[PDB]
C-alpha cells in the first residue's frame, strides 16, 4: 500500500497513551514527563528482572512480507542505572508457526547521562506475527524511549 520514504509509524509519546507499546514480562510500561528527547514526554520501562523483558510493540499490522523498513528511536537509562547495552529485536512466527528471533541492530552502550540513537533495517520472508521489543543484556536496567519511527525503505 505504501511507497519508499513513507512513514509507517511515528511515536512522540506527547499525548496520554503508550501508543500501543505494552509490557513484555512483569514490567511497568508507561509515559513519563520527567525526561524526554523531544517535547515533554517519553516512554519509560521499569521493573525488569530478566534480560528478555522490555517494552514491546506488535508490528503484525505495520510490516508486511518482503518490505524493507527502517526502525529508529532515541534511548536513555533511568537515573541511577549503571551503563548497559540496548538493542531492538523482532520475535516472529515463521511460515510453520515456529518462533524466530531476528536482529534489527547491534546493541549500543547507553548511560543515564545522554540520549543515544538506535537504528536498523528490518525485513522478513515468511511469517504470521511480528513483535518488536527493546531489550538489554543487563536484566535489571530501566530505560526510556522517545521519537520512535518506522519508515518504508523498499516496497515489497
Ligand atoms: Ca517525546
From Swiss-Prot:
Family: Belongs to the glycosyl hydrolase 10 (cellulase F) family.
Domain notes: Consists of three different domains. The central region of the enzyme is the catalytic domain. The N-terminal region contains cenC-type cellulose-binding domains and seems to act as a thermostabilizing domain: a derivative lacking this region shows a lower optimum temperature for activity (35 degrees Celsius) than the full-length enzyme, and a reduced thermal stability that results in a complete inactivation of the enzyme after 2 hours incubation at 55 degrees Celsius. The C-terminal region contains family 9 carbohydrate-binding modules.
Protein name in UniProt: Endo-1,4-beta-xylanase C
Top-rank lineage group of the source organism: Bacteria
Annotated function: Endoxylanase with high hydrolytic activity on birchwood and oat spelt xylan. Xylotetraose, xylotriose, xylobiose and xylose are the main products from birchwood xylan hydrolysis. Shows increasing activity on xylo-oligosaccharides of increasing length. Displays very low hydrolytic activity on Avicel, carboxymethylcellulose (CMC) and p-nitrophenyl-beta-xylopyranoside. Also shows transxylosidase activity, allowing the formation of xylo-oligosaccharides of higher degree of polymerization than the starting substrate.
Species the sequence originates in: Paenibacillus barcinonensis
Domain CBM-cenC: 5-153
